[PDB]
Design an enzyme around this catalytic site. Structure first.
Site, PDB file in Angstrom:
ATOM      1  N   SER A   1       0.853  -1.187   0.000  1.00  0.00           N
ATOM      2  CA  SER A   1       0.000   0.000   0.000  1.00  0.00           C
ATOM      3  C   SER A   1       0.892   1.243   0.000  1.00  0.00           C
ATOM      4  CB  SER A   1      -0.945  -0.012   1.206  1.00  0.00           C
ATOM      5  OG  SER A   1      -0.231   0.054   2.425  1.00  0.00           O
TER       6      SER A   1
ATOM      7  N   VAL B   1       0.645   4.405   2.061  1.00  0.00           N
ATOM      8  CA  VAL B   1       0.969   5.112   3.306  1.00  0.00           C
ATOM      9  C   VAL B   1       1.814   4.257   4.259  1.00  0.00           C
ATOM     10  CG1 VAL B   1       0.022   6.270   5.352  1.00  0.00           C
ATOM     11  CG2 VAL B   1      -1.116   6.519   3.130  1.00  0.00           C
ATOM     12  N   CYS B   2       1.547   2.951   4.285  1.00  0.00           N
ATOM     13  CA  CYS B   2       2.237   2.012   5.184  1.00  0.00           C
ATOM     14  C   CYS B   2       3.772   2.068   5.137  1.00  0.00           C
ATOM     15  CB  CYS B   2       1.774   0.574   4.916  1.00  0.00           C
ATOM     16  SG  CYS B   2       0.031   0.265   5.294  1.00  0.00           S
ATOM     17  N   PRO B   3       4.372   2.078   3.926  1.00  0.00           N
ATOM     18  CA  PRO B   3       5.841   2.076   3.846  1.00  0.00           C
ATOM     19  C   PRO B   3       6.505   3.316   4.452  1.00  0.00           C
ATOM     20  CG  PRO B   3       4.864   2.439   1.678  1.00  0.00           C
ATOM     21  CD  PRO B   3       3.761   1.992   2.587  1.00  0.00           C
TER      22      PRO B   3
END
Lengths: 167, 167, 166, 167, 167, 165, 165, 167, 166, 167
Positions: F44, F46-48
């Site tokens: 995804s 935003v997660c990184p």
């Protein structure tokens, strides 16, 4: 755990009355006073004396507008034979109710579940079907018909006049 | 909803046997084969014929190591009077069990709760107390003693030999 | 606990009847006297003689206005096969009900859960569906077709002359 | 709601096996691989090519240390008659289990309650008793015996190969 | 215990289909035949030959009016990444349903609660939504795409000529 | 339902840790401060960023005797794939726990049943297993690693200094 | 038990608001962004710092169309006393809700039953009543008003911008 | 419904006593007579004359071997601040129990769940811990410290010469 | 539903007895025949005659080895006051049980919950505590002390000659 | 577990009032302020100075629009006899309610089940029916009628004064 001022449940059962069979129900009891006279067993030794003494006072009870219903866990068939067999029972003019299913004995709460027989119980019930006074004795303890008539007169006396007073 | 291979419960009750009263229990039944012979009412019209036909074959049942126990919701007192009153019942040599409390009729499941009387039921029970075959008829449908003897012999035949075969 | 004066429950059922498969239901059974003849299993040695004895008395039961329904836990397929294999079963004219569900055996209360087979039991039922007179035998104890006829004759007699008034 | 890695419940049932009746239990089944082959009904108008196809590969399954157990709600009596009637079942060498009381069908969850017959279901079970893979089909949807053999061969492949199998 | 002739419950879920994300529902599945192809994990060290093998037969399954629905507990993000990483998954043209909430796996009864992954299971479903046949295999026991096609053809030809085999 | 001073339950799970799979259990986590860093889904957008921002502070967290455990409902297979597919994820040195069976998400009460994805939640946990301070954010609301490091320092400061004013 | 996207329940309570008592209800809070700022006890040492740090950012929060509601289990009588006894508390302009019956603390699941005091918890809530992002800290772990303002901005940014990458 | 002759449950709580904080428990209360003086709020616009009035009689209550325990849903922080704000509370020498968790108010049955405040209630308790007499007044209905002393003296003189009034 | 052959439950009870207060318990009652004489209320017009009639027959019941226990829902304080006020009650020699709890009335199943007063009921109890013969009258229907004596004499006769063997 | 602001349940009971028996109900009680004065027992060896003290201030209470209702588990018959015996009760002008069935005592929760007697309890009730303040004492701990008057006066003070009472 008492039946004072409890209405008779709706019921119908066989009876023995003046040498022939009939069907008595709750409707037949209403209108007159009534004494249910429970007793343990037909073809017994103590029972005939109690039933025979109730017969002697039956005319006086009739006079007081009161019917008598003797009750046992025996069938209506057995009552007929008991009337034929013993002269004391043959003299009985009142209706002998049969209760083989136990509906009455259980309703009034006078059934010995071990023996399968009714206790020596008596119940005075008003014309509206309300239980007014009653008596339960164990087997072997005989009753007195005179006292049972007194209670009925005593209860009728209170039924007519709202405010009782001592002499 | 069936009693095949169900053991007799522990019970004790009054009986009428050769003009006198006794107390029969579960222990008295074990050891011999047994036929419980339920019937509706004493001092009845159809019952004496069924009981009288069971008496005729009672010697043959005795020979097959089998006792007969007639059962009714009447008391032992009533059975005595019925034996005195009617010659057919007076001839009965087998024990007449009384069941006023209904323990037997309810255990075997042959009680009509409305009537308070046992159905015309018969039960063949092994010496170990196991119910092997039985019959329930409604009131008015009479039984055949010969067939009831045949079933007992048929069940005894299977009891002795593990593997039955057709001719 | 007994089943006297209990009406037949609503049910449908596959049956082999006189060389052909049909579907019997409660409606087809009502309106005439019924005998329900339960038996343990098809392709056994003790069952044929009982079912054959009923066929001998079947024409007489037809005159008395009574249909016979043999019942076991076998499928309808098995009844046809049993009729083809043995002559005793092949001559059967009355319908042979199949009860692999156990719905009949369980209603009549006559199933042996351990074996999954019905006891040797016979139920006489009135046109109104009321169970009137029956018997339950353990496995191994055979029956007498003549007695069933006498009981049906007897139970009919009472039905005509209400409550044994004769 | 699945049986993967579930052990066989302890049971006992009658069976037709190699022209004779023998009792089968978990004791007998354990220790070797096992295929439980459920099918709707004996004497079906439908041709039992499935049972024949399993027999064709039964020798193959013998050499893979795997016994075959066919199952239906028919009795052992019905199995014998089916073998005597049709050559296809006559050549069956693997044991034919009887499940008239539904014991096995209910455990595996393959009984159609409405017809009282098992579905066309196949279960591959390990020597330890664990269900490794299975298959359930509606009535009319036939199976492929070669597929079952393949699944057995595959499940054995993994069974041996513990290490280096996505640890 | 048995999902035969059970209708598909109502649901929506994310899916990867031929390069883009879509939303698949129960409505979208009805109308055509359907194969639900469950598998344990995306990016598995076990090469997804099962999924690639289903793709080889997809053109054929399309001509039989049947859609293929691969199902996995991975997300739809992962489905796309897995397609971009390996050619086998990149050549997949049928929808790849994501079941991170486990609603499908739980409904079909195919989830391994411990691992949180679906077993290697395949369900064939009719246009009406009725589950017609299925298989469930333990982890490590592969499947045969050809055999699923055979089952569907069998189911379809039974559906075409149902309840009329051998008059 | 505040979950503070509740002890971490006993569990085992798979994880991807610095180019290798490992089995992490409760006993491995116990004995030292820990931050459970929940996030909704691998691959995804935003997660990184969030996970990368944690890696930038990981050496400090390690100096402060604290281990990071990133957690999602993705499998350990997916963690490995995401690591050698993305540069930001490949650089991470802390354990990436997998929670496909959802035991961690359910226990922390951080699972969105509709998605089957964890919210953006961070939990600080003491060496004794006691949950001390946490935040739970909706999807699309990013976190700040600095703030989380500050809260750890505060928690550790309180642990040592009793009767502080 | 994550409490996100759960709507604020219907309630009324007493409050001390800028030198005056008021009755705040759910309907007054609805229609605009709101931050529920829970704290354990009046007349304590750490609480005033936190509440003061919120007042420094209150004008910005007001510009961003957001109201602050500080909440404790102390009565409104105590809020007034604490305001004109302490300079930091006297300077506050936002409503100070009282929760002696504990309805707010129990609904937010932020009550410590032993103390009968709320934890240091902050909840962001949308104009529609939806709980969007929150944190729950143990006693003695201070908060950062800046971070909370950042999270509001993020929540508001997500609310407006749909399909953002 | 009635707390007469009920023993004090086990509890600990914070309290303000003569300039410092302490921890009061059930153990600390037993041994002497005890008056639990509940009130609705610290920093009340209603001047705490009730609390000041109890202080005037405190020296007397000490000589009767009785401790006074004021109880309120406010914290112990608030108790100290309230003492520093007003002389009436600053002159209080008995312990001021804080009940923010409501354990006392709930036990004594004196909490108003809506407002979260205790009613104006007073409980007299024996050295054994038995509740001997009490009063509960609505908000706004004040109390009379003298009358509480009278009740305690009455309770004590009954305790001194108990079960021996008028032989 | 009836109370025949039910043993007395364990209970303690305040009583006014011959110008002094005592404490009767189940142990004091057991070991000798008991008559429990329930009555509606102290300071009524219909009750005195019943209780007085029992006192006339009390000495005879002492010879028959039977103690009398009058019971009502009044307190023991009220019994003493009732004895002082009226001569009929003042001459009572048997113990007067007090039942403000209703524990006796409820056990004997003879309380009128509406009025909170006991019915005019009499229970004969054996030395083993077994209830043997009783009667329950509605308010207004008086009793006959002579009948209670005859019933006790009768129930004792059976107890001596087991199960009516005479 | 308290009765503040609880309305009186609808009831009816007998009472001795001004040398005669009269029935009292909520209908009669509502519309005016009310004090329910519970006490253990009539004819107690303990002197009824409490009832006398209430009579001394009864005229005061009359002028404050407040009727007094004394209550105990004694019957109305016992109340009349108590008045005829002792001058202290003979001078009582307020109604003396009888609670032999516990109706009132149980509602207020002031019945000692073990003795069957009410505690020394006083309840102040409003014309609207709401219980404003009350007091419960053990047997032996006497009350002060002047205190009750003060509480009534105080509760009336607040009752009138709605506005400007900590709104």
């Amino acid at each position: 755990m008492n039946l004072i001022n409890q209405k008779l449940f709706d019921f119908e059962c066989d009876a023995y009355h003046d040498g022939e069979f009939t069907r008595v129900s709750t409707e037949d009891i209403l209108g007159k006073w009534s004494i249910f006279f429970f007793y343990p067993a037909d073809f017994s030794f103590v029972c005939p004396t109690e039933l025979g003494d109730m017969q002697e006072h039956y005319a006086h009870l009739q006079e007081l507008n009161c019917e008598v219903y003797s009750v046992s866990e025996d069938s209506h068939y057995v009552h007929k034979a008991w009337a034929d067999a013993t002269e004391t029972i043959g003299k009985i003019k009142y209706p002998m109710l049969a209760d083989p299913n136990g509906q009455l004995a259980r309703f009034f709460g006078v059934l010995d579940e071990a023996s399968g027989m009714a206790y020596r119980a008596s119940f005075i019930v008003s014309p509206e079907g309300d239980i007014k006074s009653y008596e339960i004795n164990d087997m072997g303890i005989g009753r007195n018909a005179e006292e049972l008539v007194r209670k009925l007169e005593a209860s009728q006396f209170v039924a007519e006049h709202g405010d009782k007073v001592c002499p």
